[PDB]
């Protein structure tokens, strides 16, 4: 019986996490939701609290901690440990009652809970990709110290890849570890992309796209930031780096392929040239579930895949001219050092600027290129505590520099 | 270092088997070809003998045993054990020097060597599907006695399925064993089909197709019998039953899907509804290699898959009206008992009759239906020796009855 915490429960991933847990529990109860944790949204956390009755509840924002303790008074015969800020986060990671922790907090901020989840030797079902991009070697170093901790990828493409693996080999190693690809006989990765809503546009049309065109008609509603990254393909850019770290695959062995129906979620070519891929409808229910039940699988009543209903599956290379964020991500990843940190930090700004209609589409890649060009490699700190500080200083600097380039231009 | 015998070496599978062995050995020598075995074709066996220098050589046909011993005299410093008939076959299966045996003999006749390979506790890389159709429960019974013997499927779709499996689970069991699908969390199988050359024909055009239209433009040259079965889709019919036996999957959980580009070789849906599939270009080099290196994989220099070059992959249900052999195969398999034996035996005849332009296309299914309709279930023999005899008597009877229906109609 699997004890699970959901970090970022009110968001897209968190909501989807509880949905599949709920649905699986109907068939046979095997999950216990032990904790939930959010930033600002008090009401919805309360609603989730009544449904799942988690032993722990927590909220980052101090100033709604009163406004919440209050609301949880209405549940009868229910006394939860109710906590606040990073301190609550740390306490939940400490609990000897929680086995597995889902990381559905967005952006750079997801790194802190991921960091502590590892420190506490937990299974970490990680959807937050920014943490891996900004801090992969830090996470590697940290996973090396804490032998029993594990990152199980929830990002759908990375879930797919992980599912294509013979667990006979995976079990001899773990994600984000040198030699993962050699132990798993991995030769190369096809990293599938939906292509986003802007895929068939001319350069001219592209120049003019807006924040609004990007958010429109979600297959399922994702957080605003990933949705924008999907649209610039910076999301695939980030996922390239994430692949390199998770599975120790060289950048030259990672191929981005646009596959608009999103049925094949990614493919692994093995050293004999046999390719294995994972398929399902565009959905996060399966990656989340698998990360919670690995190395096993359990029954669900999800809609079965129907290949004849899908009928056609297509594959084409992305245009680097239309989607330059991809190139930038490869450049940054191949240079290594802290360039991924800079890539990620400057995108966060340019993503928000475009989101709030502050900048045009090609200004996104323009900002990110200028910031990367302005960065200079630093000696990688030796101990974990110093490395973290260094990551933080570089992250804030790249953010400031991005804001700065925008300011110095209107 | 892997010691391999190739049964049916001069045929399509046997030739392809040695090709991949040769090519893999160039990269790093890991295979030793220990034996080769054929029916009638003396010259080519000799040629293979000079290339591979196998410790044993054998030929079924007694009357070319002289004509061969003669030819092998020309190789210098090379003294092979040269054998004949079933007796040679048995001796090779006995050898303590041979680990793994590839079964590339066609038709019902492949059952004998498969039978003895199992009896001798060998790894059996089995491409011959007819043996599984005619004798699955006999093979199951036999694999139960001989714990260390294993059928590793070489049939590409079955190879694909086997490759989609977590070897962590496979290793707890083996192919052709009750509960295989439960231990592997298998819910259902998409069994892919090329569809054959007749796929877009109208009923009228279909009625008129010839033996010649069927053999035309092989992607790679296959034996005449499988090629014809491919064309009627009786080949997929047989593979449905083969799937049921190999992986203990219910017939209602096996779906035939026409996928003309033949890149996805088959898919496995697991109990959580996640689907895994294996992909490559239409080729037998990979299934053969995998069956020889399982549970491991090794390097090859095969042409890598290029999804953007493939571009489109399509899936549609087959027409039972155009391809009634498929229905007949499901009917026979679901009835069980010895109906698969009858299905297989009567097809062999109707396949040959069509091949030699003796009958029309729909006469194939007509003959096979009449034979099945005429059969009556028998109590399944209790001991292995009696079961075998019973399989043999039913096989010959269905053949005679098929010939007979044809005779009584011109
Ligand atoms: N959405 C998706 O299908 C996918 C998402 N991902 C990744 O997963 C992560 C989650 O993204 P997504 O769910 O889309 O984003 P959302 O905006 O939908 O959700 C963010 C969640 O994190 C919470 N959060 C923000 N800050 C904190 C904090 N400091 N402490 C605790 N919780 C916090 C939010 O809380 P609050 O509600 O209180 O504001 C909310 O619950 C991202 O990194 C994304 O890249 C990866 C693949 C697919
Ligand atoms: N061809 C393919 O790509 C595929 C084949 N298969 C299966 O594999 C099996 C082999 O088919 P395929 O290679 O096409 O057929 P072929 O006709 O090309 O080859 C048959 C081989 O078996 C040999 N043979 C026949 N009788 C005997 C015997 N009594 N003793 C020893 N050898 C014998 C033949 O010898 P000889 O040359 O002397 O006549 C020849 O070497 C079939 O059951 C088929 O269904 C499955 C999937 C794909
Ligand atoms: C319509 O369905 C999809 C839309 C977008 C995406 C991808 O973004 C979200 C993501 O990383 N997932 C699901 O792992 P993509 O980066 O391929 O556009 C994947 C599927
Ligand atoms: C053009 O490539 C192909 C032609 C035919 C087939 C199949 O027949 C041969 C076979 O069983 N294999 C390869 O496992 P199918 O039964 O799908 O027509 C598979 C691929
Ligand atoms: Mg993703
Ligand atoms: Mg086949």
UniProtKB/Swiss-Prot annotation, chains A, B:
NADP(+) binds at residues 10-13, 39-41, 130, 223. GO terms for cellular component: apicoplast. Its EC number is 1.1.1.267. It is an enzyme of class 1 (oxidoreductase). GO terms for biological process: isopentenyl diphosphate biosynthetic process, methylerythritol 4-phosphate pathway involved in terpenoid biosynthetic process. Keywords: Apicoplast, Isoprene biosynthesis, Magnesium, Manganese, Metal-binding, NADP, Oxidoreductase, Plastid, Transit peptide. Its main location: plastid. Mn(2+) binds at residues 155, 157, 239. Its cofactor is Mg(2+); Mn(2+). Binds 1 divalent cation per subunit. Mg(2+) or Mn(2+). Inhibited by fosmidomycin and its derivative FT900098. It catalyses: 2-C-methyl-D-erythritol 4-phosphate + NADP(+) = 1-deoxy-D-xylulose 5-phosphate + NADPH + H(+). 1-deoxy-D-xylulose 5-phosphate binds at residues 129, 156-157, 194, 217, 230, 235-236, 239. Mg(2+) binds at residues 155, 157, 239. It is found in: Plastid, Apicoplast. Belongs to the DXR family. Catalyzes the NADPH-dependent rearrangement and reduction of 1-deoxy-D-xylulose-5-phosphate (DXP) to 2-C-methyl-D-erythritol 4-phosphate (MEP). Homodimer. This is 1-deoxy-D-xylulose 5-phosphate reductoisomerase, apicoplastic. The lineage of its organism: Eukaryota, Sar, Alveolata, Apicomplexa, Aconoidasida.
């Amino acid at each position: 019986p699997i004890n699970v915490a959901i970090f970022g429960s009110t968001g897209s991933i968190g909501t989807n996490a509880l949905n599949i847990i709920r649905e699986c529990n109907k068939i046979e109860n095997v999950f216990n939701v032990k904790a939930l944790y959010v930033n600002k949204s008090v009401n919805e956390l309360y609603e989730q609290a009544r449904e799942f009755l988690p032993e722990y509840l927590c909220i980052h924002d101090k100033s709604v901690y009163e406004e919440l303790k209050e609301l949880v008074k209405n549940i009868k015969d229910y006394k939860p440990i109710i906590l606040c800020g990073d301190e609550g986060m740390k306490e939940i990671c400490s609990s000897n009652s929680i086995d597995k922790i889902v990381i559905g907090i967005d952006s750079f901020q997801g790194l802190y809970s991921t960091m502590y989840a590892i420190m506490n030797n937990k299974i970490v079902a990680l959807a937050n990709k920014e943490s891996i991009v900004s801090a992969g070697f830090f996470l590697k170093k940290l996973l090396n110290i804490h032998k029993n901790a594990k990152i199980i990828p929830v990002d759908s493409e990375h879930s797919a890849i992980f599912q294509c693996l013979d667990n006979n080999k995976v079990l001899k190693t773990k994600c984000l570890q040198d030699n993962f690809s050699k132990i798993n006989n991995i030769n190369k990765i096809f990293l599938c992309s939906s292509g986003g809503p802007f895929q068939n546009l001319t350069m001219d049309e592209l120049k003019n796209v807006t924040s609004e065109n990007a958010l429109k008609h979600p297959k399922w509603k994702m957080g605003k930031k990933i949705t924008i990254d999907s649209a610039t393909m910076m999301n695939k850019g980030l996922e390239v780096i994430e692949t390199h770290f998770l599975f120790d695959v060289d950048y030259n062995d990672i191929e981005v392929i646009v596959h608009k129906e999103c049925i094949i979620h990614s493919c692994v070519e093995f050293i004999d040239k046999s390719v294995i891929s994972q398929m399902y409808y565009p959905d996060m229910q399966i990656p989340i579930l698998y990360s919670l039940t690995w190395p096993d699988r359990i029954k669900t009543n999800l809609k079965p895949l129907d290949l004849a209903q899908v009928s056609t599956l297509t594959f084409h290379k992305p245009s680097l001219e239309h989607f330059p964020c991809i190139k930038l991500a490869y450049q940054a990843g191949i240079k290594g050092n802290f360039y991924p940190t800079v890539l990620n930090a400057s995108n966060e700004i340019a993503n928000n600027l475009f989101l709030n209609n502050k900048i045009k589409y090609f200004d996104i890649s323009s900002i990110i290129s200028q910031v990367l060009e302005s960065f200079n490699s630093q000696k990688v700190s030796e101990n974990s505590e110093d490395l973290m500080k260094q990551i933080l200083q570089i992250h804030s600097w790249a953010k400031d520099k991005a804001t700065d380039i925008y300011n110095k231009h209107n």
